[PDB]
């Protein structure tokens, strides 16, 4: 059948990129060919195995990890870089194979005021290990004194709201990024197109 | 237009009182929290107090504590230092500046006053 | 266990002033922006206020600005909203929501969980 | 031919801190994605976090967040769950379960599922 | 603001008919509407989030469309359990406003 | 935690074919995550029946068979014994990485 | 109280040239850390925020760098308006503590 790429990339929603969401995609027909020639995809960029040639390739599973970051952290995305993304919100690996696919959403995403829920993190006690997302929201010790539940002086919460606007330039529009990772294993491969 | 003006100072006696204002106009005072920082003649910057957005929390340097009180009053837009129990080390100038963020991610000041020149001796 | 409940209403002069404070648990307060939502008897609902994520912005309906006071006190869960000087078309149901995109029981700028309701009516 | 070895059981007064091996076998530990599976007495499973030694991740459930502290040490094939901050209702029988398939993404079945470690929390 | 219409105002209707609800927008409204079901005596369950999508634990026979101005709320096939006040919420502006709701009845 | 429901007992008979449903949301079960079906006989550590919602390991009969549809999933057992009066459990995965255990049948002979 | 030590303290520099300012710090801030320039006589003015991020109203001559420990603010070219103190100070940790000074005498 045809494979389900409608539920991924148009869809209504996407999640904030501390809070990402994986959706498992097997038992395709899919044509990789067609989603290059969207004239709409800003940044494609395929780590591991090469662009154009993805017609011609099986895999065991596609987990695309979807997320909603604004314009100067699509290059966060991406092994071995750091940041207020890759180092809190959402770590790649080293080998990661796969591609990052972002787009300029101004329209849909951002919306004039706030849109004060795409949230990220900001505060934590150590860097992220790869693929770990992390939903706790414990207050962040930033001296040496203790907390002790409340926030104030030396004791950060670690969510800030990106607050979007349509009035901000192109480097603070919400690029909706969607992550094709995928890796085959032991087994017969199950999703490739003609 | 923000900007911030700096009153008070002069000359005092050792073990004496003093204290310094700092109004504001430009900007919603209440939505800001702001710190005092301080000089002496010919050295560095030093950070000695600061404030929350709403007078709740305050927070002093480690050798200012105990005998320097900070205040703000939103309706007034300005803020307050008081001073007590003085010596010859705190003779400096005191710079008022203001947060650039709003209530979070607390780090990191925007705009710088003009200071208030302080005297101790006999 | 998600859970608002609330307190405080009840019945005053026009023209008085009453708060109402809806006291949350089963979820972290602090990442869901607030809001109050009244329903007059009979009629449709109307959106009242918001209190931001952190305390950055405290927006109010037309027909309310200038009279009402939305608080937040994130150590103890519990949201406040201060009416001031309570004319009579003021009486309704004041419900407290919740919302906020956490790829989780988020409901992605939508109020999804809603108080039991405490009814505020004016009358002498 | 492969299949995981716990610890006994153990008994510990409310408030403080187990610790809890499941020593791997058969095979690599590299390879591993061991996930740590509650049961209560009498009651269905439930499951706590997963580990992948290779990264270093450990995604824990929502519920066991800050509690349950998953560590793997590679070189002695030692995966730990150092749960803490105990009290009655974490009576239970922690399991142990290599994750099925792969190692990098660990969304599969479960197998071998090692043995019971009955930490009957009282005193 | 953003003035939210909101068409019919009460409706009856037979059990298992498509039932079809619109609401028409002001200004352009990028697929952040709602829509909510308040049974008469209860607080209001949300039904479908971000003008697409159910509430996750909703019978499946709801389905909202549309994106922009104009929204429609098509009840498959109806129910006894499915005859209350149905709002409409567009989640854009700092000005949150809502429709006037459809009173669901029986012929 | 446990969202994939299931139904708390069926019962049976010896040489009948009983169904047991494991009914998600759009998440766990909708979202591509296949259902797997573990059996629990009473005082050891739970096996395995059905992976990937079809298969078979070697140690189970051919009795055990399973497939699923849109959101819900299934498990059929033809010709119930003595060696079917156990505990069968449900599993798959969330979006939030997270794993999701059934509530669990409790399959019964007459 | 972390403690960053500021080189070099005093330098001379002409126009036409190109130079930097180290201010290494003991306790690991990440990103937050803010120059300054002050003419002697009257308040500092602030050149960039957050370490990498240029004030408007300042030339574009100044460019932060650096991330962690240590950073460098670099001037690509030296101009007459550069005969001032350039501090550094961390806000990770809430005792701020600002650098010692770099004496800039343009000979
Ligand atoms: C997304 O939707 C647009 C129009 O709704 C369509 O042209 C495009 O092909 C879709 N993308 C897919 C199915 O990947």
Not at chain 1, 134 to 144: L, R
Request: net charge neutral.
């Amino acid at each position: 059948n045809l494979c389900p790429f409608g539920e991924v990339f148009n869809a209504t929603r996407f999640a904030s990129v501390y809070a990402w969401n994986r959706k498992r995609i097997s038992n395709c027909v899919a044509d990789y060919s067609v989603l290059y020639n969207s004239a709409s995809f800003s940044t494609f960029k395929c780590y591991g195995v090469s662009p154009t040639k993805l017609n011609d390739l099986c895999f065991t599973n596609v987990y695309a990890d979807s997320f909603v970051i604004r314009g100067d952290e699509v290059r966060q995305i991406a092994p071995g870089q750091t940041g207020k993304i890759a180092d809190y919100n959402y770590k790649l690996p080293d080998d990661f194979t796969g591609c990052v696919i972002a787009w300029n959403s101004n329209n849909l995403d951002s919306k004039v005021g706030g849109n004060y829920n795409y949230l990220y993190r900001l505060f934590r006690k150590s860097n992220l290990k790869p693929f770990e997302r992390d939903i706790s929201t414990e207050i962040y010790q930033a001296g040496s004194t203790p907390c002790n539940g409340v926030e104030g002086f030396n004791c950060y919460f670690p969510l800030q709201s990106y607050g979007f606007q349509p009035t901000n330039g192109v480097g603070y529009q919400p690029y909706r990024v969607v992550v094709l990772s995928f890796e085959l294993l032991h087994a017969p491969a199950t999703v490739c197109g003609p | 237009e923000v900007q911030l003006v700096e009153s008070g100072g002069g000359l005092v006696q050792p073990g004496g009182s003093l204290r310094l204002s700092c109004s504001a106009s430009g900007f919603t005072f209440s939505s800001y929290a702001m710190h005092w920082v301080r000089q002496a003649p010919g050295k560095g910057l030093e950070y000695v107090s600061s404030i929350s957005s709403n007078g709740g929390s305050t927070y002093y340097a480690d050798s200012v504590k105990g005998r320097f009180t900070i205040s703000r009053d939103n309706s007034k837009n300005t803020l307050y230092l008081q001073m007590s129990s003085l010596r010859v080390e705190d003779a400096a100038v005191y710079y008022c500046v203001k947060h650039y963020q709003q209530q979070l991610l607390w780090g990191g000041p925007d705009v710088w006053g003009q200071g208030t020149t302080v005297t101790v001796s006999s | 266990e998600v859970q608002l409940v609330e307190s405080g209403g009840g019945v005053v002069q026009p023209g008085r002033s009453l708060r109402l404070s809806c006291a949350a648990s089963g979820f972290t307060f602090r990442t869901y922006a607030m809001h109050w939502v009244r329903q007059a008897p009979g009629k449709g609902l109307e959106w009242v206020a918001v209190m931001w994520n952190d305390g950055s912005n405290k927006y109010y309906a037309d027909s309310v600005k200038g009279r009402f006071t939305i608080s937040r006190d994130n150590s103890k869960n519990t949201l406040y909203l201060e009416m001031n000087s309570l004319r009579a078309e003021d009486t309704a149901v004041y419900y407290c929501a919740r919302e906020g995109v956490a790829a989780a029981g988020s409901s992605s700028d939508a109020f999804d969980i809603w108080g039991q309701g405490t009814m505020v009516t004016v009358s002498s | 031919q492969v299949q995981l070895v716990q610890s006994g059981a153990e008994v510990k007064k409310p408030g403080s801190s187990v610790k809890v091996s499941c020593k791997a076998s058969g095979g690599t530990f590299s390879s591993f994605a061991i996930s740590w599976v509650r049961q209560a007495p009498g009651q269905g499973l439930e499951w706590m976090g997963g580990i992948i030694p290779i990264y270093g991740t450990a995604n824990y459930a929502q519920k066991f967040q800050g509690r349950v502290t998953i560590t793997a040490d590679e070189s002695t094939s030692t995966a730990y769950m150092d749960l803490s901050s105990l009290r009655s209702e974490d009576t239970a029988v922690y399991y142990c379960a290599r994750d099925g398939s792969s190692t990098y993404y660990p969304h599969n079945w479960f197998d071998p599922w090692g043995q019971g470690t009955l930490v009957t929390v009282s005193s | 603001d953003i003035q939210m219409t909101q068409s019919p105002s009460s409706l009856s209707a037979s059990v298992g008919d498509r039932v079809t609800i619109t609401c028409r927008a002001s200004q352009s409204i990028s697929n952040f509407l709602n829509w909510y079901q308040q049974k008469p005596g209860k607080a209001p369950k949300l039904l479908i989030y971000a003008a697409s999508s159910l509430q996750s634990g909703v019978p499946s026979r709801f389905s909202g469309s549309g994106s922009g101005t104009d929204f429609t709320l098509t009840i498959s096939s109806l129910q006894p359990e499915d005859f209350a006040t149905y709002y409409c919420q567009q989640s854009y502006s700092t000005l949150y406003s809502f429709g006037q709701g459809t009173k669901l009845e029986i012929k | 935690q446990s969202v994939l429901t299931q139904p708390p007992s069926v019962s049976g008979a010896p040489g009948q074919r009983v169904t047991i449903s494991c009914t998600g949301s759009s998440s766990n079960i909708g979202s591509g995550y296949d259902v797997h079906w573990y059996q629990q006989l009473p005082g050891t550590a739970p096996k395995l029946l059905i992976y990937g919602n079809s298969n078979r390991p070697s140690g189970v009969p051919d009795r055990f068979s399973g497939s699923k549809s849109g959101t819900s999933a299934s498990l059929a057992i033809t010709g119930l014994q003595a060696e079917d009066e156990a505990d069968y459990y449900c599993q798959s995965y969330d979006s939030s990485l997270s794993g999701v255990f059934g509530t669990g049948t409790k399959v019964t002979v007459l």
